[PDB]
Every structure is written in C-alpha cells, then in structure tokens.
C-alpha cells in the first residue's frame, strides 16, 4: 500500500524494489514468480536475476513491513527456487534481509522453509559466493541464514540480529536491555564478530555492496577476476 | 473356579501394588469384572493396566489418594461397584469406611465393624480372649497411668518388662525394659511418642518372653457361623519387628500342638463372631507353650505361602463368603500338601541396620518364572518408579516343594535367577538367611538377625573353594571379553591379523588380596590355574544376557555381570552377594605397581544422607560439637522414621539441612570437623 | 545382543509435565548394544550428550539433548561440542543417531555478545552436510528453530520418529499431529520399539550414496 510505503520512507528506509533497482544495473532486473500468492501477489519477497557491471547475479529482497503478514510457505519456495537457479548456472546470490513486519506468532510451520533455506546455503557453500545485507530487524531462525553465508553486512541504526527479543531477555534473565544494545549493528560489528561491515544508510550500503561484488569471482570454478591495470 | 455360580459382576480394588494385581487376577479367574483406583503417579502401574476401567483417586500422597475417602465413594458411585476389597493396610481397618459403605448398598469384603471394633486395641482384646478360654501372656490388665503403678506391675509380673503402645502397631510404640528406673523412663518416653504419633496416650505393661517363636494361624469365618483354621505359619526371621522370611509349615510344632493351636484360634474367632478371613498371632517359648498376641482382621501379607500347602485361594473364599455362600471345605478336608518358603524382596540396602530403603527407577526387571516351583507376587515392571510415598516393597518370592531341602534349593535358585537393576535390594541378605546352617537345622528365634549378625550384615563369607570358583569365573569372563573384542568383519583392504596368545597371565585383586591366574582357552572351555588349583569353566559365554550360567568343575553356577570397565573393575553378583574385582594383565600389574595412591582425602569427618525422603527436624546448628552416638536428624520416608548418629566427635562447620526440607540419598547433610 | 530386543522401561521415562526433566543417558543406555556408551566430554557442556556406541555390532555416533542441565537449551559450548563430533562422525562414514528434546536457545546478553549465532550456524552446518545415514527420534520437545538445528527432515534427514509424548511447535501445536500430517516425521513409534526400528533403518541405509556439487571445500562459519 501507499501508506505503508510512506511509513517505510519516513524511517529512512527504501522499498524492496527500490533496493533492487539501486543494486543492479539499470534495465537489467528480471523478476521470477511474480504471480505466486499465499491474498496478495508477491508474498512479501521479490526474487530475480540481474547484472552488476555486466556480470550475472541472483538477488532476493524482503519487504515484510510494507507487504505481507509473516513468512508463508511460498516465501521459502521462492527463495529456494532462486538459489537452485543460481547453483545451476553458477552465479553468486545476494540477499537483502528485512523481517520488520513479520509476525512470529503467524508462523504456519515456517521452520520447514527455514530448514530448506539452511540446507541450500550449506550446499551452495564453497560453490558460489553468498552475500547477505541486513537492512532491517531480524529475529528467530532467520538470523541463521546470514551466518551461513560468506559475508554479512548491516546498516547502522536500522538493522538488528538477535535470537530472542529484549522482552524475552527481561522475562528470563531479568536484565534491562534495549534492541540497539542487544542486536544493533555496532554490537555485531565491534564486539560480537557476526557482521563484517556497517554502512551509514541504504544507498551507501548498496554502493559499497556493488564495489565489493566487483572483487569476487562468479564461481569457484572461475579463477580470480582480472581487471584493467594502470 | 466355577463361572456358573452367581457372584458380584463388578468388583472395586481400593489398594495398590502387588495385592491389587493379585485380587485382579483372582477376580478374572472368577469371571468378575474389575475396576481399580490409583493416584496420579501410578497412572501406568501393573494393576491399572491389567484391570478394565480406572479412576484417579487423588494426588501422589496416600493421605490424599488412598485415604481421601470421598474420592473412593465418588468412584464407586460412578462405576456402580457392588463391593470393594481393601487388601491389607490403608483402609483395611477403618470403621468409618465400614459405616459409610453400610450407608449405601455396597457390601464390604472383610470382617464386620464389630470385629474390628473389638480387635482395635490390645487390652480389651486380651480381656475378651481370656474370657474365651485362650492362653495369653501373663501380665496386668487395665490402663497404666503412672510410673509408680508401672514399676509395681514390674515387681509383681517379673523382672523382664515390656511397654506397648496400644492400637497403632506396625513395629512402633514398643520397648523392652530391664529395670525399675528403665521401666519408669520407658513409660514416660513411650507416653511421649504415643502423644506424638498415635495420640492414644494409653499404654500397656507386659511380661517379656525370652527367645520366642512367632506363629500365625490363618482362620476363615462366614455369616453362617462356620469357623476354620488353615494350618500354621512360622515368621520368626524379622528385623525392626518386621517380617522378611516366612515359613508355612512350622518345623518346631508337632501335630497335637498344632491341633491345639487351631482349636484355640477357632474358639477365639467364634467368640468375636468373625465372618471373614484373618490371622491370629502367637508366641511360643522353648517349652512349646503358646500365648496369644494380637489378631489381624484382614488378609495377611504372607497369605500365599499357606495356599502353597493347602491349594485353596484365600481371595476367592473371601469373595464367596461376602456374597453369602457358605464354606465348601470342612475341618477334615484341609491337609498339608508339601512345603513352602516365602521371602519378601524389598527395595532396601541390607548392609545398614538390616535394611535401608532407597528410591530409584527400575532399568531392568526380570522374574524367574521359568524355574520350577516358583511363584512371584509383584506389582512392578521394567520402568517402574520407587517414590518416597509408599511401601519400599518390591515383590514376594514363594518356592514350594516336597520337603524342606528341595524348597530351599528352589528358593536359592530363584534368588540367583532374579534380575533387578536400578535400585538396591536385599537379595543377598535373604540368600544368606536361607542358606544359614541354623535356618536349615531349624533352630531360630525372633532375634535371629540380631545374634547371628551382631555387628550388622556384612555379606557372604565365601570359602576357599567358592573363592577359587569366583576368581576362575571372573578371569574366564575377562578373557572371553578380550577374545570377543578381536572379532571384526573382513576388510578386504587391510586384513586383520588375529593375535595367537596361548596363555593369559592375570592379576586379580579381590577385597584386599592379589591372586595370580593363568587362563587357557580351547573352544568354549577355559582351563584356569589359581595359585596351584586347577579348574575348568565351560558355558555359552553370551556376553549380552544379564544372567550367565557356567559349569565350573561340574558345579552349575549362575552369575551376573552388573558392571564392567576398561580399567579392569568388574562387579559380579555370585551366590547372591556382589563382589568387586580388579583384573589386569601381569605386565599391567607390574606397571601399576609404580602408580601413586593420589591425594584422595580419605579423612572421613563428613556425614551423608542414606535416607532419601523428608527430614522432619535437625538437632544440630552451625557451630556445635557432635558426640559419639548422638543422632543428627530424623528423616521420614517409607512409612517410618529413623535417625542417624555421627559416631565421632567434631565441631560442625556448617549445616546444609533444615527442618522440613527434602534430602536425597547420599547428599551431604552436615559438615563436621 | 539381539537387534529386535524390546525396551519396555522407556515407555514411561518421559514425565507428563513439561517442567519436569529426565535423563537422556538412561534412554541411550537402554537403546544401545549391551548398554555400553563411550561418552565424549562428559563434564563439559552437560546440556548436550555426544558419544560412541554400537548397534547390531556397527559403530554409531550418538548426539542428544539433556533436559537435566539448563532444561536442554542449546548454547555456544554445546553447539561447538556437538558440531565437531558430528563432523568427525560424518568424515569417517559413521552413522548418526539423534535424540531431540530442546526448548530453544539460551537467551541473555552474554550469549548474544559471545556470538551464539555463529555457533548455532556451526551446528546447523554440521548436521546439514552430513552424508552418512542419520536417524532422528524426538522424545518430548522441539520448539522454534532449535528443531531445525538437530537434523530436521528438511536437512536430508533419512528417518525421523516421534514418541507419543513428543510435541513440535513454533513458539511456546501441543501434539505431534501437525508434523505427522505435514510429513515431518515418518511415524509415531512406541518408545519400547526404538531399538528395532533404528537397527532396521541402519541396515537399509548402510548403502546410502548422494551426490553434491564439486568444490575444493566449503566455508563453515568457524
Ligand atoms: N509380649 C512379647 N514378648 C516378646 N516379644 C514380643 C512381645 N510382643 C511383641 N513382641 C515382638 O514384637 C514383634 C511385633 O509384635 P506385635 O505384633 O505386637 O507388633 P505390632 O507393631 O502391633 O504388629 P503388626 O504390624 O502385626 O500390627 C513380635 O514379632 C515379637 O518379636
Ligand atoms: C503405605 O505404603 C502402607 C503400605 C501398606 C500397609 C503396610 S504393609 C502391611 C502392613 N499392614 C498394615 O496395616 N501396614 C503395613
Ligand atoms: Mg504383628
């Protein structure tokens, strides 16, 4: 909805399609599974393929805050399908993680989809590069997919990574901690060792993601990339 | 077992354990539908599983499950049970239950309320017995109220004195006094515990018989006025005034004395107008003079053993009597039909105070039902849990035969072939009792355990031949395990070259001695050389079965391998007792000779908790110097209470147990210096 | 030791109350041959149990949860301890047997600061890449992503079984029926028949072969 998009923009965040457009080359995104519904089309994930500086890549983005209620089965099916295509052709996978508007209670055995995604990440490990960019809050088993990828980046002040929420921490261990201290980008980049880099905002993060992707090869079969030298 | 005969269609069993299962089996044999009650803990017990329908009758504790009477009446109303069988204990002697059942149409299988009212206490029961022309213990009738009266009664009834707390029972509120000062102090103290435990506040002074034999007469009565006595029983072997070994045909009594016993018991029962099954107990001196002592108005715990010498079913006869039908057996019909011996297997440690109850879960439980002439009355199964709420009883093992020797041999074989893993039992104590020389001879008394074992049970004092056999079996089993460890499947890439060692030289440490063993293997035969002695051990060498039968020099021996470690420590149950042995190779023994004893602090000065249960109170506080013989705390569990003494002098550094807390087995109660 | 031996003592070992705990080592001893179990790291990270045993004479590796310690919750130490053992067993063609009773992961600021995510991913990876035959039995609980951690059906788990007292749910679905109807467990077996089922499954799975994409080596989240 337009109101949800405006609310997302008010927080200094972009939509999933805007992030995909910024990340990929202009006029190179090809989307897949457009008409897969859960009743809305898209199922809170945008999956497809594109080119960065003329090199093929497969991407998926999440817009739970502005679209969808929680992880259904088709979300995991779309992610698994795009990962299978990437492993078939031999191209890297880039995943923009944003599980803001995802209801933990509204999970109809989404752990099965989580397990399928984990299995595909493990299978693709060492075969194709995998990059994860956490652009929003994340909780539950969804935090394990970025951990299994090769590289993990976060956005400052707008990204989180934690097993259980601060309320559960207060209920169990009886300690007052906020979300920023528990799973903020600074915590995971300075004292936790989970994330690799933190960026000021979404645009800067995507620019650095393109620059970093220029370094990596497309597959383990290919040799290290060689560019023009001066 | 005639199903054409009309009896109750639905029967309720208001009990638990072995007795519930036994009653259910009898009712199934009689074609009666059965319903059983249980607590929340016993939701999967044997009796609830084997009996059609089941109702929860309350939480875990007995006071709110098997004594929460309103729950029982609601269950009966829901299931429309015509009759209830109380078994023994709990509500077997509650007159309020009798009147409550009489209020409704439900008939109570047992003695009428008048009989239990008469046999509710001791003194007026003795009065009515004496009015029935029955020999009784000499003494002074009436209520003792002052120490002066007690000591005077001591003067005119003889120097040995005994103080009894009336009513109650179960081996509590009982003391022997050997002096007038002892008489008065025991009187006041026993009044104190009577106030604390029973609340009757009324005592009895009696003459104490020296070296008595406890003889039971099983009697049956009906509403038609027919009274019968089923032989006798002998239950002298007991500790804490609680029976452990029971013997149906008394070896001490002859025919005419037994007939006198039966006639007197029948007369006493007719005096009470007894109309059910019961047992009357008697004390017999060395001069074959019998004196009355109590009668239980319920089915006895050792009821099955007399069945093995009579052939009739007590529960079936009780049900038929309750229905209204008269007895179909007369005085002349009952005869002795062989020999029978029963042992009560408890979940207690026999090495401490002739029995030390413990809790746990049964990892393995196997019964010797395939052995000839063996009957097991048990209410547990593999996976059963022993709580801190009920009887520590495990089962009853009954062996019947033609005579004494065959029955005792069968009892020993059954005890050897009984598998209990998960708790500590008293099988070793029972086997030592049944193989004792005095027990076989027949000269026993009520204090057999006290005088035969003065300092407490220690185990089996195995002889030289038995020691050699045990060492040979242990060495052979160790070598068998070593040989089995070398059997691998074919690899086809790196073939296994099996070693061809001929003789195994082993060092076996047992108790405190070290023996040298030379073992040789030939097929399934082990030739064992122990300090010059030569033995041959043959068996199937099945290393997975809990029981292992081995033929050592022709003698058949059943052993169990309770534990086994790669370091060589092995626990072997052999002839009832479990022995810990350490078997190593000779080179390993020489190398271990240089190993240090380590800094293991074997300085004692620490008292632990052999009682799992609830500690009632603590008599020490942090900063107290304990003394020898001074009890630290009393722990209640298993329907009894007992206190443990330090046995040494030492200041208490800290106290970890407080009054009303729960302390498990082996936990540190109080640390002393 | 016959491979068809029954274990009736396991029928009532799991307490009905979810709060009450039990000992998994008892179940492991009951299931395995001759009740022999060589435990690894028995005094470190006691909320997980790993070791070597034998079934029908074949060496097997066993991983399970311990509800006695920390209610069976998974933490950093348990994750690493289980992960390395699973990796070693997989590397040398040793079948794996898993007993699952886990409420989730231990919460707190210390666990988050220590990198619980990385070690959880370690355990997921170790269970996921295993190509040896693996048999999983759920005893009481499997909550949240912790169920996915210990060899879920979707990690190429060969055979999965659930006891009648098992329960699988997303959050704190009180019955194993959702997993059964969704195909997450092959059968709901009686506790006393675990040994025979496991032995038959190992016998039929001894010849398992799978093919994976070529690589020099993968990138485990060490
Ligand atoms: N008058 C007595 N003289 C000697 N010993 C006695 C006497 N009365 C009891 N005893 C001893 O105490 C034991 C138990 O006695 P008794 O049956 O009176 O106790 P109880 O606790 O009332 O028993 P129960 O459990 O049958 O109700 C006897 O087996 C015997 O060893
Ligand atoms: C609680 O566990 C009581 C067990 C049954 C009663 C025990 S056993 C038989 C004895 N007779 C009696 O009245 N109490 C004793
Ligand atoms: Mg008595």
mmCIF file of N, CA and C in Angstrom, chain A residues 91-172:
data_model
loop_
_atom_site.group_PDB
_atom_site.id
_atom_site.type_symbol
_atom_site.label_atom_id
_atom_site.label_comp_id
_atom_site.label_asym_id
_atom_site.label_seq_id
_atom_site.Cartn_x
_atom_site.Cartn_y
_atom_site.Cartn_z
ATOM 1 N N UNK A 91 26.212 -18.646 -10.367
ATOM 2 C CA UNK A 91 26.280 -17.213 -10.139
ATOM 3 C C UNK A 91 26.074 -16.913 -8.663
ATOM 4 N N UNK A 92 26.651 -15.823 -8.163
ATOM 5 C CA UNK A 92 26.517 -15.504 -6.739
ATOM 6 C C UNK A 92 25.093 -15.120 -6.370
ATOM 7 N N UNK A 93 24.795 -15.255 -5.079
ATOM 8 C CA UNK A 93 23.497 -14.905 -4.517
ATOM 9 C C UNK A 93 23.691 -13.740 -3.559
ATOM 10 N N UNK A 94 22.861 -12.712 -3.708
ATOM 11 C CA UNK A 94 22.848 -11.556 -2.819
ATOM 12 C C UNK A 94 21.467 -11.466 -2.189
ATOM 13 N N UNK A 95 21.424 -11.427 -0.861
ATOM 14 C CA UNK A 95 20.159 -11.396 -0.158
ATOM 15 C C UNK A 95 20.002 -10.207 0.763
ATOM 16 N N UNK A 96 18.975 -9.398 0.520
ATOM 17 C CA UNK A 96 18.670 -8.249 1.362
ATOM 18 C C UNK A 96 17.632 -8.676 2.393
ATOM 19 N N UNK A 97 18.052 -8.765 3.651
ATOM 20 C CA UNK A 97 17.222 -9.288 4.728
ATOM 21 C C UNK A 97 16.507 -8.139 5.426
ATOM 22 N N UNK A 98 15.182 -8.244 5.529
ATOM 23 C CA UNK A 98 14.379 -7.250 6.238
ATOM 24 C C UNK A 98 13.103 -7.952 6.696
ATOM 25 N N UNK A 99 13.064 -8.337 7.968
ATOM 26 C CA UNK A 99 11.932 -9.047 8.552
ATOM 27 C C UNK A 99 11.193 -8.182 9.568
ATOM 28 N N UNK A 100 11.023 -6.901 9.252
ATOM 29 C CA UNK A 100 10.346 -5.980 10.142
ATOM 30 C C UNK A 100 8.912 -6.360 10.446
ATOM 31 N N UNK A 101 8.056 -6.332 9.430
ATOM 32 C CA UNK A 101 6.655 -6.650 9.618
ATOM 33 C C UNK A 101 6.345 -8.123 9.460
ATOM 34 N N UNK A 102 7.099 -8.972 10.153
ATOM 35 C CA UNK A 102 6.899 -10.417 10.129
ATOM 36 C C UNK A 102 6.422 -10.852 11.508
ATOM 37 N N UNK A 103 5.264 -11.503 11.554
ATOM 38 C CA UNK A 103 4.682 -11.935 12.818
ATOM 39 C C UNK A 103 5.243 -13.297 13.203
ATOM 40 N N UNK A 104 5.908 -13.360 14.359
ATOM 41 C CA UNK A 104 6.433 -14.634 14.844
ATOM 42 C C UNK A 104 5.291 -15.586 15.175
ATOM 43 N N UNK A 105 4.183 -15.051 15.691
ATOM 44 C CA UNK A 105 3.030 -15.887 16.004
ATOM 45 C C UNK A 105 2.386 -16.457 14.748
ATOM 46 N N UNK A 106 2.368 -15.694 13.658
ATOM 47 C CA UNK A 106 1.751 -16.146 12.410
ATOM 48 C C UNK A 106 2.714 -16.990 11.581
ATOM 49 N N UNK A 107 3.325 -17.984 12.216
ATOM 50 C CA UNK A 107 4.191 -18.906 11.511
ATOM 51 C C UNK A 107 3.569 -20.279 11.368
ATOM 52 N N UNK A 108 3.102 -20.611 10.169
ATOM 53 C CA UNK A 108 2.490 -21.926 9.923
ATOM 54 C C UNK A 108 3.633 -22.851 9.525
ATOM 55 N N UNK A 109 4.344 -23.339 10.540
ATOM 56 C CA UNK A 109 5.473 -24.252 10.375
ATOM 57 C C UNK A 109 6.466 -23.732 9.336
ATOM 58 N N UNK A 110 6.779 -22.438 9.440
ATOM 59 C CA UNK A 110 7.798 -21.836 8.587
ATOM 60 C C UNK A 110 9.194 -22.356 8.896
ATOM 61 N N UNK A 111 9.360 -23.071 10.011
ATOM 62 C CA UNK A 111 10.644 -23.684 10.323
ATOM 63 C C UNK A 111 11.072 -24.668 9.243
ATOM 64 N N UNK A 112 10.111 -25.293 8.558
ATOM 65 C CA UNK A 112 10.449 -26.164 7.436
ATOM 66 C C UNK A 112 11.101 -25.374 6.306
ATOM 67 N N UNK A 113 10.538 -24.211 5.978
ATOM 68 C CA UNK A 113 11.155 -23.364 4.972
ATOM 69 C C UNK A 113 12.511 -22.848 5.407
ATOM 70 N N UNK A 114 12.644 -22.508 6.692
ATOM 71 C CA UNK A 114 13.947 -22.119 7.218
ATOM 72 C C UNK A 114 14.963 -23.238 7.041
ATOM 73 N N UNK A 115 14.561 -24.476 7.334
ATOM 74 C CA UNK A 115 15.468 -25.611 7.193
ATOM 75 C C UNK A 115 15.848 -25.842 5.737
ATOM 76 N N UNK A 116 14.894 -25.686 4.817
ATOM 77 C CA UNK A 116 15.218 -25.821 3.399
ATOM 78 C C UNK A 116 16.216 -24.756 2.959
ATOM 79 N N UNK A 117 16.013 -23.514 3.403
ATOM 80 C CA UNK A 117 16.946 -22.444 3.066
ATOM 81 C C UNK A 117 18.324 -22.739 3.646
ATOM 82 N N UNK A 118 18.373 -23.229 4.888
ATOM 83 C CA UNK A 118 19.650 -23.578 5.501
ATOM 84 C C UNK A 118 20.356 -24.672 4.714
ATOM 85 N N UNK A 119 19.607 -25.689 4.287
ATOM 86 C CA UNK A 119 20.199 -26.769 3.508
ATOM 87 C C UNK A 119 20.772 -26.247 2.200
ATOM 88 N N UNK A 120 20.056 -25.336 1.540
ATOM 89 C CA UNK A 120 20.570 -24.797 0.284
ATOM 90 C C UNK A 120 21.789 -23.906 0.507
ATOM 91 N N UNK A 121 21.815 -23.138 1.600
ATOM 92 C CA UNK A 121 23.015 -22.362 1.912
ATOM 93 C C UNK A 121 24.208 -23.270 2.176
ATOM 94 N N UNK A 122 23.994 -24.373 2.893
ATOM 95 C CA UNK A 122 25.091 -25.298 3.163
ATOM 96 C C UNK A 122 25.566 -25.958 1.873
ATOM 97 N N UNK A 123 24.632 -26.358 1.008
ATOM 98 C CA UNK A 123 25.010 -26.984 -0.256
ATOM 99 C C UNK A 123 25.785 -26.017 -1.143
ATOM 100 N N UNK A 124 25.339 -24.765 -1.221
ATOM 101 C CA UNK A 124 25.999 -23.772 -2.058
ATOM 102 C C UNK A 124 27.289 -23.241 -1.452
ATOM 103 N N UNK A 125 27.582 -23.569 -0.196
ATOM 104 C CA UNK A 125 28.792 -23.079 0.448
ATOM 105 C C UNK A 125 30.023 -23.645 -0.244
ATOM 106 N N UNK A 126 30.924 -22.759 -0.663
ATOM 107 C CA UNK A 126 32.118 -23.158 -1.373
ATOM 108 C C UNK A 126 31.941 -23.358 -2.860
ATOM 109 N N UNK A 127 30.720 -23.255 -3.373
ATOM 110 C CA UNK A 127 30.448 -23.403 -4.797
ATOM 111 C C UNK A 127 30.215 -22.053 -5.459
ATOM 112 N N UNK A 128 29.349 -21.232 -4.875
ATOM 113 C CA UNK A 128 29.098 -19.881 -5.367
ATOM 114 C C UNK A 128 29.182 -18.919 -4.189
ATOM 115 N N UNK A 129 29.647 -17.688 -4.391
ATOM 116 C CA UNK A 129 29.660 -16.722 -3.288
ATOM 117 C C UNK A 129 28.249 -16.368 -2.848
ATOM 118 N N UNK A 130 28.097 -16.114 -1.551
ATOM 119 C CA UNK A 130 26.820 -15.725 -0.971
ATOM 120 C C UNK A 130 27.033 -14.505 -0.091
ATOM 121 N N UNK A 131 26.267 -13.449 -0.347
ATOM 122 C CA UNK A 131 26.382 -12.195 0.386
ATOM 123 C C UNK A 131 25.027 -11.861 0.987
ATOM 124 N N UNK A 132 25.030 -11.443 2.249
ATOM 125 C CA UNK A 132 23.818 -11.056 2.957
ATOM 126 C C UNK A 132 23.966 -9.630 3.462
ATOM 127 N N UNK A 133 22.941 -8.813 3.230
ATOM 128 C CA UNK A 133 22.894 -7.439 3.718
ATOM 129 C C UNK A 133 21.633 -7.287 4.557
ATOM 130 N N UNK A 134 21.801 -7.149 5.868
ATOM 131 C CA UNK A 134 20.668 -6.984 6.772
ATOM 132 C C UNK A 134 20.275 -5.512 6.783
ATOM 133 N N UNK A 135 19.090 -5.212 6.255
ATOM 134 C CA UNK A 135 18.612 -3.846 6.125
ATOM 135 C C UNK A 135 17.498 -3.517 7.107
ATOM 136 N N UNK A 136 17.068 -4.482 7.916
ATOM 137 C CA UNK A 136 16.011 -4.270 8.875
ATOM 138 C C UNK A 136 16.099 -5.250 10.026
ATOM 139 N N UNK A 137 15.174 -5.148 10.978
ATOM 140 C CA UNK A 137 15.195 -6.066 12.123
ATOM 141 C C UNK A 137 14.992 -7.511 11.692
ATOM 142 N N UNK A 138 15.697 -8.416 12.367
ATOM 143 C CA UNK A 138 15.592 -9.844 12.114
ATOM 144 C C UNK A 138 15.593 -10.585 13.441
ATOM 145 N N UNK A 139 14.802 -11.652 13.519
ATOM 146 C CA UNK A 139 14.693 -12.429 14.744
ATOM 147 C C UNK A 139 14.348 -13.867 14.394
ATOM 148 N N UNK A 140 14.599 -14.760 15.346
ATOM 149 C CA UNK A 140 14.317 -16.164 15.144
ATOM 150 C C UNK A 140 15.322 -16.825 14.218
ATOM 151 N N UNK A 141 14.942 -18.006 13.729
ATOM 152 C CA UNK A 141 15.831 -18.795 12.892
ATOM 153 C C UNK A 141 16.314 -18.073 11.653
ATOM 154 N N UNK A 142 15.614 -17.014 11.242
ATOM 155 C CA UNK A 142 16.045 -16.234 10.089
ATOM 156 C C UNK A 142 17.434 -15.641 10.278
ATOM 157 N N UNK A 143 17.906 -15.509 11.521
ATOM 158 C CA UNK A 143 19.245 -14.975 11.741
ATOM 159 C C UNK A 143 20.336 -15.958 11.354
ATOM 160 N N UNK A 144 19.983 -17.212 11.070
ATOM 161 C CA UNK A 144 20.989 -18.228 10.791
ATOM 162 C C UNK A 144 21.392 -18.283 9.324
ATOM 163 N N UNK A 145 20.520 -17.848 8.415
ATOM 164 C CA UNK A 145 20.901 -17.789 7.005
ATOM 165 C C UNK A 145 22.049 -16.820 6.751
ATOM 166 N N UNK A 146 22.036 -15.578 7.253
ATOM 167 C CA UNK A 146 23.218 -14.721 7.071
ATOM 168 C C UNK A 146 24.476 -15.285 7.701
ATOM 169 N N UNK A 147 24.353 -15.999 8.822
ATOM 170 C CA UNK A 147 25.528 -16.566 9.471
ATOM 171 C C UNK A 147 26.171 -17.654 8.623
ATOM 172 N N UNK A 148 25.377 -18.379 7.836
ATOM 173 C CA UNK A 148 25.913 -19.422 6.973
ATOM 174 C C UNK A 148 26.473 -18.882 5.665
ATOM 175 N N UNK A 149 26.194 -17.628 5.325
ATOM 176 C CA UNK A 149 26.723 -17.040 4.106
ATOM 177 C C UNK A 149 28.182 -16.633 4.303
ATOM 178 N N UNK A 150 28.834 -16.289 3.192
ATOM 179 C CA UNK A 150 30.255 -15.961 3.242
ATOM 180 C C UNK A 150 30.492 -14.612 3.909
ATOM 181 N N UNK A 151 29.699 -13.603 3.555
ATOM 182 C CA UNK A 151 29.881 -12.260 4.081
ATOM 183 C C UNK A 151 28.547 -11.687 4.533
ATOM 184 N N UNK A 152 28.604 -10.867 5.580
ATOM 185 C CA UNK A 152 27.418 -10.276 6.184
ATOM 186 C C UNK A 152 27.669 -8.800 6.446
ATOM 187 N N UNK A 153 26.766 -7.950 5.964
ATOM 188 C CA UNK A 153 26.845 -6.515 6.179
ATOM 189 C C UNK A 153 25.530 -6.019 6.762
ATOM 190 N N UNK A 154 25.612 -4.950 7.549
ATOM 191 C CA UNK A 154 24.443 -4.363 8.185
ATOM 192 C C UNK A 154 24.419 -2.862 7.942
ATOM 193 N N UNK A 155 23.254 -2.269 8.188
ATOM 194 C CA UNK A 155 23.039 -0.833 8.066
ATOM 195 C C UNK A 155 22.872 -0.262 9.466
ATOM 196 N N UNK A 156 23.576 0.829 9.749
ATOM 197 C CA UNK A 156 23.585 1.387 11.092
ATOM 198 C C UNK A 156 22.214 1.929 11.478
ATOM 199 N N UNK A 157 21.805 1.633 12.714
ATOM 200 C CA UNK A 157 20.639 2.223 13.367
ATOM 201 C C UNK A 157 19.316 1.731 12.792
ATOM 202 N N UNK A 158 19.360 0.928 11.727
ATOM 203 C CA UNK A 158 18.145 0.396 11.127
ATOM 204 C C UNK A 158 18.170 -1.113 10.928
ATOM 205 N N UNK A 159 19.152 -1.819 11.484
ATOM 206 C CA UNK A 159 19.269 -3.258 11.313
ATOM 207 C C UNK A 159 19.513 -3.919 12.660
ATOM 208 N N UNK A 160 18.992 -5.135 12.811
ATOM 209 C CA UNK A 160 19.132 -5.888 14.046
ATOM 210 C C UNK A 160 19.315 -7.364 13.727
ATOM 211 N N UNK A 161 19.990 -8.063 14.636
ATOM 212 C CA UNK A 161 20.204 -9.502 14.511
ATOM 213 C C UNK A 161 20.271 -10.075 15.919
ATOM 214 N N UNK A 162 19.282 -10.886 16.288
ATOM 215 C CA UNK A 162 19.230 -11.459 17.624
ATOM 216 C C UNK A 162 18.320 -12.679 17.625
ATOM 217 N N UNK A 163 18.612 -13.611 18.535
ATOM 218 C CA UNK A 163 17.825 -14.838 18.631
ATOM 219 C C UNK A 163 16.442 -14.543 19.197
ATOM 220 N N UNK A 164 16.390 -13.926 20.374
ATOM 221 C CA UNK A 164 15.138 -13.635 21.054
ATOM 222 C C UNK A 164 15.079 -12.156 21.403
ATOM 223 N N UNK A 165 13.861 -11.625 21.452
ATOM 224 C CA UNK A 165 13.649 -10.215 21.675
ATOM 225 C C UNK A 165 14.025 -9.772 23.073
ATOM 226 N N UNK A 166 14.158 -8.456 23.264
ATOM 227 C CA UNK A 166 14.506 -7.940 24.597
ATOM 228 C C UNK A 166 13.488 -8.288 25.668
ATOM 229 N N UNK A 167 12.209 -8.407 25.307
ATOM 230 C CA UNK A 167 11.194 -8.772 26.291
ATOM 231 C C UNK A 167 11.440 -10.169 26.849
ATOM 232 N N UNK A 168 11.810 -11.117 25.986
ATOM 233 C CA UNK A 168 12.133 -12.461 26.455
ATOM 234 C C UNK A 168 13.371 -12.431 27.344
ATOM 235 N N UNK A 169 14.355 -11.599 26.991
ATOM 236 C CA UNK A 169 15.556 -11.471 27.813
ATOM 237 C C UNK A 169 15.198 -10.956 29.202
ATOM 238 N N UNK A 170 14.338 -9.937 29.270
ATOM 239 C CA UNK A 170 13.890 -9.430 30.564
ATOM 240 C C UNK A 170 13.115 -10.488 31.339
ATOM 241 N N UNK A 171 12.260 -11.247 30.653
ATOM 242 C CA UNK A 171 11.459 -12.259 31.334
ATOM 243 C C UNK A 171 12.330 -13.366 31.914
ATOM 244 N N UNK A 172 13.374 -13.768 31.191
ATOM 245 C CA UNK A 172 14.168 -14.924 31.594
ATOM 246 C C UNK A 172 15.326 -14.508 32.492
#
